[PDB]
Amino acid sequence: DLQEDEDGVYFSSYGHYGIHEEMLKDKVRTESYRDFIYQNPHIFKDKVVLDVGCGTGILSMFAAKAGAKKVIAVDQSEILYQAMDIIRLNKLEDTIVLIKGKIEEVSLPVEKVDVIISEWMGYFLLFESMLDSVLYAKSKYLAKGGSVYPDICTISLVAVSDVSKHADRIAFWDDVYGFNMSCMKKAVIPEAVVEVVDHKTLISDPCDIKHIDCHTTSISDLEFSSDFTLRTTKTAMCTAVAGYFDIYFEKNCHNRVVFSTGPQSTKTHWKQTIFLLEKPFPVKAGEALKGKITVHKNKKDPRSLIVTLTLNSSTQTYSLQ
Ligand SMILES: Nc1ncnc2c1ncn2[C@@H]1O[C@H](CSCC[C@H](N)C(=O)O)[C@@H](O)[C@H]1O
Numbered sequence: 001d002l003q004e005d006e007d008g009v010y011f012s013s014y015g016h017y018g019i020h021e022e023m024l025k026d027k028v029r030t031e032s033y034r035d036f037i038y039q040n041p042h043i044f045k046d047k048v049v050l051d052v053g054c055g056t057g058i059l060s061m062f063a064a065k066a067g068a069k070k071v072i073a074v075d076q077s078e079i080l081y082q083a084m085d086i087i088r089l090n091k092l093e094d095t096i097v098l099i100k101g102k103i104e105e106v107s108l109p110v111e112k113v114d115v116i117i118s119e120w121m122g123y124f125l126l127f128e129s130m131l132d133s134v135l136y137a138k139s140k141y142l143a144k145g146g147s148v149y150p151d152i153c154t155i156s157l158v159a160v161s162d163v164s165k166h167a168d169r170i171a172f173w174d175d176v177y178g179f180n181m182s183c184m185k186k187a188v189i190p191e192a193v194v195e196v197v198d199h200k201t202l203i204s205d206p207c208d209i210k211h212i213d214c215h216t217t218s219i220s221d222l223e224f225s226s227d228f229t230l231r232t233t234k235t236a237m238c239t240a241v242a243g244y245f246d247i248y249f250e251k252n253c254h255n256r257v258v259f260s261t262g263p264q265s266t267k268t269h270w271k272q273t274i275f276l277l278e279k280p281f282p283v284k285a286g287e288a289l290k291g292k293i294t295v296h297k298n299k300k301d302p303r304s305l306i307v308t309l310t311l312n313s314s315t316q317t318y319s320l321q
Pocket residue numbers: 011014020023024052053054055056057058059074075076077079101102103104119120130133
């Protein structure tokens with residue numbers, strides 16, 4: 001589902017600089033990878049590294065500077081040509097070789113690799129389905145005893161109370177300049193929203209719903225279902241549930257690195273994913289709220305996701321893009 005096709009629109013959006021300007025300007029994201037690599041040179045010095053989805057080539061340059069014997073940087077979009085130029089501009093041609101194409105179909109100049117690095121995550125962590133490609137490369141190229149980074153990730157949910165943001169999106173259509181447009185809500189609620197959540201509006205402790213180990217995880221594990229319980233922290237009206245993720249650099253590290261894309265942390269370009277509830281419900285502090293969430297990829301467009309959520313004995317299916 002992700003090994004075949006093409007996805008024109010997909011690799012075409014990664015052809016322009018804007019999207020890369022945004023990632024590079026994401027300090028939490030970029031400095032986290034820089035610190036990991038530079039602070040654990042033992043992992044790269046004299047090793048062969050593979051950068052899955054190199055973009056402008058930034059991660060590969062970090063590895064080279066750390067001591068990599070050879071780095072292989074691959075990308076399917078046209079941004080690969082601007083990377084060919086950037087590597088030359090920095091005089092790293094004798095260390096980093098570039099290849100244009102899909103990681104699951106191109107021919108590598110080597111058999112196996114010692115380390116694999118990649119920034120493949122999307123909104124709610126799995127949007128875009130790039131982890132599938134990373135797992136593919138892991139199976140075919142990782143040497144026995146090798147490591148993939150970042151190696152561990154997790155996804156969590158948090159209860160929210162914000163009646164004004166709810167009204168702004170839903171109740172709004174009830175009266176537009178004196179006219180009723182209520183029929184519009186039917187197409188608004190089912191859509192998940194990527195946006196920054198005010199930390200002061202969280203009404204429950206966060207709860208983990210997924211754990212991933214890029215060494216033991218498989219492709220089939222990326223479509224799951226999970227029961228969870230949120231422990232209420234405040235007496236307020238629950239209007240929505242927010243999701244986010246955390247990334248970890250751990251195996252063989254003398255200096256471990258971690259970063260969160262949650263509401264209590266510094267903003268990142270990933271923000272947070274919001275599932276508005278059709279019917280907000282009163283919650284009391286100390287209360288325990290049992291729920292269920294199922295995440296599956298759109299069968300018609302494998303890069304998009306489908307989320308089924310149950311809370312307060314009410315179920316709703318949302319779609320992410
Ligand atoms: N199957 C695949 N094969 C090769 N490149 C892929 C891919 N799926 C996604 N990509 C590429 O991986 C990139 C994800 S963005 C990461 C870019 C860069 N490494 C950064 O850290 O700044 C995009 O350039 C996208 O085109």
